[PDB]
Design a protein around this nucleic acid. Structure first.
Lengths: 169, 169
DNA sequence: ACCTGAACACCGTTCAAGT
DNA sequence: ACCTGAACACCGTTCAAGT
């Protein structure tokens, strides 16, 4: 009997072992000894499946940050994210694609978490979303590039550029 | 007789008309009445072809910025980029993918152009590259999200956050 | 409910062979 | 030089039918 965490575990193993291009619905059915159209009972499509793989990826990226100042909130969040991504082959491409799809709920949670920190820094209520997104655009972009180069930090510099744009309200 | 600008013109028409998912080597050979393995004489692969399509996309995004202050340099560059991208279906996904591939020479030119502006603002010589990349991570991320939502600004807010992180040296 | 069989409509890339 | 034919080794998704 096949259950969703079966699937996500197996696809994660494919990602770690072979990269995001070898993560295909057919190959994933091959590692579970099932028919490719089996997976479509549990997931609506490869997008939803990859979003689940992103959530499983990022279970370790959520760190508690409420008893910390609004700069340590940001830095600590972004550090935890980047370290969750750098721990899986093409982790940052996968999570970035799920964020552009709309299929990782915890990447949305992390954007809420840093939106709170942007608020707590003085930006107006109507510009909070824009800011938080700004931050994650940066760290997703950065880790994609970084994981590229590695597979063939001064992360803090680019991040501090943003926390300074934020210092001014 | 088939020449590279033939190809790039035709693929651009496919992108405008149908989106980046319908831009496939086979479909592109179909619009040129050629065999799919014809395109592989002129381009090494779909990556190189898409980089060429990105360069043709971004011929309009280069604006002259040497007789302007280092904030108008940034704002003007980023405005020109975002407007070149928003003028083509999935323009920002295409250009973003070519930037992650390493196959648009003018996206590299734009990163040089804003690297100069970051220099001219006081950041150290060893942190210039990091900064410029930071900027384009932001505007590529932003326009991807924006073009998503449109197909189904407060750009300036996120950008000013960065030019303020930059004000401090 | 949950999965198989089998099809539908495609992909990128290569490469001998023709002109 | 530049292109065709034809193959190689794949894709995501659907859906009747079985259990």
């Amino acid at each position: 009997q096949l259950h969703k965490p079966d699937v996500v575990a197996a696809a994660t193993k494919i990602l770690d072992d072979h990269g995001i291009a070898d993560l295909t619905m057919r190959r994933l059915a091959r590692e579970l000894d099932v028919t490719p159209g089996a997976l479509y009972w549990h997931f609506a499509n490869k997008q939803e499946l990859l979003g689940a793989v992103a959530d499983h990826i990022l279970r370790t990226a959520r760190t508690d940050t409420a008893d910390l100042a609004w700069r340590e909130q940001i830095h600590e969040s972004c550090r935890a994210l980047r370290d969750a991504l750098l721990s899986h082959t093409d982790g940052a491409e996968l999570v970035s694609a799920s964020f552009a799809s709309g299929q990782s709920v915890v990447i949305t949670e992390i954007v809420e978490q840093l939106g709170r920190a942007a608020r707590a820094a003085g930006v107006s209520d109507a510009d909070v979303d824009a800011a938080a997104r700004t931050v994650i655009y940066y760290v997703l972009g950065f880790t994609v590039d970084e994981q590229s180069r590695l597979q063939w930090r001064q992360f803090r510099f680019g991040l501090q550029l943003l926390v300074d744009g934020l210092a001014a309200h």
